[PDB]
Design a protein around this ligand. Sequence first.
Ligand SMILES: O=C1[C@@H]2CCC[C@H]([C@@H](CO)CN1Cc1ccccn1)N2S(=O)(=O)c1cc(Cl)cc(Cl)c1
Ligand code: NA
Ligand code: NA
Ligand code: NA
Length: 134
Amino acid sequence: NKKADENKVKGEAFLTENKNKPGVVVLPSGLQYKVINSGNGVKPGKSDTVTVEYTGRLIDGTVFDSTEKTGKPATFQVSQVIPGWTEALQLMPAGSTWEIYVPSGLAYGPRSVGGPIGPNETLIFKIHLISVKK
Ligand SMILES: O=C1[C@@H]2CCC[C@H]([C@@H](CO)CN1Cc1ccccn1)N2S(=O)(=O)c1cc(Cl)cc(Cl)c1
Ligand code: NA
Ligand code: NA
Ligand code: NA
């Protein structure tokens, strides 16, 4: 499928370029992140709930979801989101804003038929962790 190949090529090229940039931390899983603003709060565990502000975009800059201008943050259980978020959240002190770069395998994978997120899409998120509930 043409889109699956295109998205894989673009994502791999992005991650390969981004890993060299100052402030980009590359984890063993392949998840990448960059600290935008450091917070001093607790880090959530895998069973915790979090309140967050966030924006998700594709490599070409297209925003596909955001809490911005909605008037409310979003709430998630740490383990009930995509793996890249589950992993990233557990490293984030409350109060922090990070940009995370999620390889498609830690997001929706290669059979993501279509919709907002098609196959082999590497996803980029700005995540402001507001609070953690144990
Ligand atoms: O795991 C998630 C991730 C990470 C947390 C923020 C959002 C939530 C918004 O509810 C969606 N999920 C879980 C989810 C639930 C149902 C279907 C697909 N993904 N997403 S997302 O990647 O921005 C996203 C947002 C939207 Cl509108 C559609 C999709 Cl398919 C994915
Ligand atoms: Na693409
Ligand atoms: Na707002
Ligand atoms: Na912050």
